[PDB]
Amino acid sequence: HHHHHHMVHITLDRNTANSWLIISKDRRQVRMGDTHQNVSDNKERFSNYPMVLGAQRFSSGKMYWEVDVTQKEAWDLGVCRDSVQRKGQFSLSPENGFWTIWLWQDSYEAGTSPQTTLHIQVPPCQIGIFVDYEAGVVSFYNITDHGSLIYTFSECVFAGPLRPFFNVGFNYSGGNAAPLKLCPL
Numbered sequence: 001h002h003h004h005h006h007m008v009h010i011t012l013d014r015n016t017a018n019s020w021l022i023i024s025k026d027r028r029q030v031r032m033g034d035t036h037q038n039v040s041d042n043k044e045r046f047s048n049y050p051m052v053l054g055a056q057r058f059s060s061g062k063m064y065w066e067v068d069v070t071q072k073e074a075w076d077l078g079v080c081r082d083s084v085q086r087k088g089q090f091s092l093s094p095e096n097g098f099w100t101i102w103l104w105q106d107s108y109e110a111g112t113s114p115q116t117t118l119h120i121q122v123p124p125c126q127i128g129i130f131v132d133y134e135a136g137v138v139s140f141y142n143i144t145d146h147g148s149l150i151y152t153f154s155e156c157v158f159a160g161p162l163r164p165f166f167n168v169g170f171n172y173s174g175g176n177a178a179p180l181k182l183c184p185l
């Protein structure tokens with residue numbers, strides 16, 4: 001792909017984080033802690049899952065960023081509406097305001113309803129995410145495999161400002177402690 005020139009500097013919004021997440025000083029990395037991180041509750045925090053939003057809001061234009069997923073067993077990545085539900089249980093779907101892919105139990109899937117199987121020969125260590133607001137497109141790229149396409153959501157109905165979306169996943173296994181990291185431009 002040739003989307004690299006739309007690169008944006010994403011930072012994580014501490015206030016939206018689940019209370020177990022640990023965000024680095026530079027706001028570019030996030031991981032699951034082994035306990036509650038001693039923060040106050042607020043209406044922005046994702047309560048049920050280890051999720052956090054980027055601080056940046058997008059309502060026009062073309063945007064690109066990259067995320068490091070090295071040695072993780074489970075994660076979700078993409079974008080979402082600013083007004084997505086924070087509290088209780090929900091599924092990641094465009095109907096609920098999410099445009100995402102994930103790794104889970106050694107398979108990759110796109111967060112359609114129902115979910116769509118992805119075909120990845122080279123397990124990615126870094127994911128590229130491209131958003132074209134005007135066109136209604138969200139695309140995912142395998143940076144480990146020379147930028148090959150993973151998935152395109154088209155005919156997107158964003159219906160609001162968009163925020164970068166992250167889920168570090170649970171660590172029931174002891175094999176999923178590694179962070180998500182925003183990669184430098």
Ligand SMILES: O=C(O)COc1ccc(F)cc1
Binds near residue numbers: 018047049
């Ligand atoms: O199940 C655990 O690992 C600890 O409890 C949590 C439950 C839901 C969360 F979003 C974060 C932590």
